[PDB]
């Protein structure tokens, strides 16, 4: 039915500092995507209520 | 006679990557010089034809 696939998992890592007064950065990154399953014969699984 | 001299060998590096969707990228740098040897009055060593 409704699933998802994750491409990334969520991680985390710091920019690196080159100089004395270079300023602190931190990244989060993640990947997934979504779909309602249809089956051959054209018959949805998912409703949606209004 | 003919002769070639080199500066630096041809060397090869890699841009390291700092953030996450930094992209690959390598460089190549090579250095060198040509001269065909001479005299004083003009007389040559080398002919190259028509």
Same mark, same amino acid.
């Given at each position: @039915? +409704?699933? =998802?696939?994750? @491409?990334?998992?969520?991680? %985390? /890592?710091?920019? $690196?500092? &080159?100089?004395? !007064?270079? $300023? /602190? ?6 990947? =997934? @995507?979504?779909?309602? !399953? !249809?089956?051959? %014969?054209? +018959?949805? %699984?998912? &409703? /949606?209520?209004?």
């Amino acid at each position: @039915g +409704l699933h =998802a696939k994750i @491409g990334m998992m969520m991680s %985390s /890592y710091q920019v $690196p500092r &080159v100089m004395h !007064n270079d $300023p /602190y950065q931190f990244v989060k990154w993640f990947a =997934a @995507g979504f779909q309602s !399953n !249809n089956s051959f %014969s054209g +018959l949805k %699984s998912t &409703v /949606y209520g209004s």
